[PDB]
Every structure is written in structure tokens, then in C-alpha cells.
Amino acid sequence: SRGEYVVAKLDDLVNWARRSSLWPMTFGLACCAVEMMHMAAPRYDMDRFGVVFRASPRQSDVMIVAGTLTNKMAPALRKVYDQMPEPRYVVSMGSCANGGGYYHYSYSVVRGCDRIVPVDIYVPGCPPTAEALLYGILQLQRKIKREKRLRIWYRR
Amino acid sequence: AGRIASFLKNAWAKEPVLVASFAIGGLAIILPSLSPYTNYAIRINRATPYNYPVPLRDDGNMPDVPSHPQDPQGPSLEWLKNL
């Protein structure tokens, strides 16, 4: 009926609005952050995708973990994640953030940022290249496009 | 003579804003008393009619007061036109 059509159209509009402007706050923990800043460099120009450069945590949409998460830093990252508005996503960048990487068997390293916060996209590499991180960000956009909230509320 | 010039030269360096401000203020104080157009401005203010000119009752003893605006006698504004 028209009831499903209207919610489908509104859901498409909301998804397009949310994925056409993603505002990230970046934890520049280590060497992965340097490739982060190369994705904002003129060659790749993250800003041309609607992805703003260095958004504030109070109005950020996606969390990018770029580098090693130590035990001493995990509570701060968890607090920053907890301080985010609800439509929030986490992108794990690099091998250290994905699974501990090259310090996996260390006494002071969290073996993956997903022990602390849920992760939406995992970007492989050490560090992953700027283009690889861009691919991951674009992938997150497609994942946001695939989601459907008004439809679920309608059928529930 | 030399001390004053030295002080002004030292102030023109590392303090130009204060030198310029004091010079401009002193000029603003001094110049109006020497210009010949301040009297012209006063006269221009005098010739601006804000009120109705109330006519005078004639008694036959006012040769300087005109009876009509086109009469030659009375204040003139040709100088203002020339300005």
C-alpha cells in the first residue's frame, strides 16, 4: 500500500542525508593517522565526498580508530565513544586497531579495538593506504545506504 | 633641538601607531583655528531656514527691510551659489 511506499521514500531520503555528509572524529593514535591525513590531502580530498576534516566529538557521526590502542588509552576511547550522538559508527583502521597487529602479544596493548567498542568497518593494512581508507569510508556509505529504520518500525 | 629630533626618530620606530595618532590629533586641534572656511561653515549654518520667517509690521521707518522677497534689500545668498 501507500503506507510502505511513504516510509520507504522517507527512509531513502534519511539514508541519503546521513551518508552524503559523514563527519568523523579521528583518534590519531599512531602511524595510521599519517595516512589518515593523506586522505585529507589535495590528491584524495576527503572533503569533496562530504566528509568534513576534523569534526568535533559532540557533532561527529563516525569514529575512526587509526593506530594502536594501549591499555592506558582504552577508557578514554570508550568515554569518547559514549559521548557521541546516537547515529554513530566506528571504523577500525589498520592492523593494530583491528587485532593488535604487530604488538598483539604485548602486555600493554588491547588486542583489537572491538574489545572496547563495536566496529562497523575493518580496514586492513599496516598502515592501510590513503586510497584503501577511502575505499573503506565509501563502503561504510554503502552500508548506511543498505539500512532501513522506518520500514522496521512499520512492520513492528 | 637634537634631543627632540632623536626622540621623534626613536618613537617613529617600534611605536609608529602612537606617533601617527598624536600627529593626527594635534592637527585636528590646530587646523580649524587657521582655516578660512570655518566662517563659511558658520555662515552656511546661518542661512539654512528651519523656521518660517515671521514678517515684521511695517511702520514706514525700515528702509532695510524688503516688502517682497524679490526686493533687492535683505540678506543675499549669491556667495553660497559661488561656493
Binding site: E86, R149, W153 | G25, A28, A41, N45, T48
Partner: protein, 99 residues
């Protein structure tokens, strides 16, 4: 009337649009989970207040220029500005503009 209507319209539009912004994300369900008293900042405000008072005194200048007593008004305006400069200089030399 026209100014009142314009102010009412501006305030009403701002209020309505703020309320819709504050209530549109509140219909969908979510998780729903000192002393120091710096003294220089007070002097800045006090200096601003005094200079604003002297500006209030200076304000009628555009109409003051048509009085036919131009010498007296020029003298008084210059006097007011000189005393404003003197206040600034006194507060400058007494270390009142430091951080």
C-alpha cells in the same frame, strides 16, 4: 506596528524552527543512556562600561554640527575626546591593560 509584527515574526520563526529541530530526533527511540576569579577580566568589562558611557556622550555629534555656534561645539567635542584619550592613557600607564 510594522516593527512589532517583524520582531514577532522573527521570534516566532526562530522558536518554531528550534522546536522542530529539538523534537524531530525525539520521536524515534534511542538508547537514551571553579573559584579562581581572575581580576583582569573584570577590569576589561569595567573599562568597556566606562568607554561605552563616553561613547553615549559622544553620540549626538551628527546633529551637533548644525548649531551656528560651531567654535563652542567643536571645542566641547574635542574636549570630550581628549578626556577619553586621557582616561585611556591613565589606564595604560597604570598597568591596567596587561595580561
Amino acid at each position: 506596528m510594522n516593527i512589532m509584527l517583524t520582531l514577532l515574526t522573527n521570534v516566532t520563526l526562530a522558536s518554531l524552527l528550534v522546536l522542530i529541530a529539538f523534537w524531530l530526533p525525539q520521536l524515534n527511540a534511542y538508547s537514551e543512556k571553579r573559584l579562581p576569579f581572575s581580576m583582569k577580566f573584570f577590569l576589561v568589562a569595567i573599562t568597556f562600561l566606562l568607554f561605552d558611557l563616553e561613547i553615549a556622550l559622544l553620540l549626538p555629534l551628527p546633529w551637533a554640527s548644525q548649531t551656528n555656534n560651531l567654535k563652542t561645539m567643536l571645542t566641547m567635542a574635542l574636549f570630550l575626546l581628549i578626556l577619553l584619550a586621557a582616561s585611556l592613557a591613565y589606564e595604560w600607564t597604570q598597568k591596567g591593560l596587561e595580561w
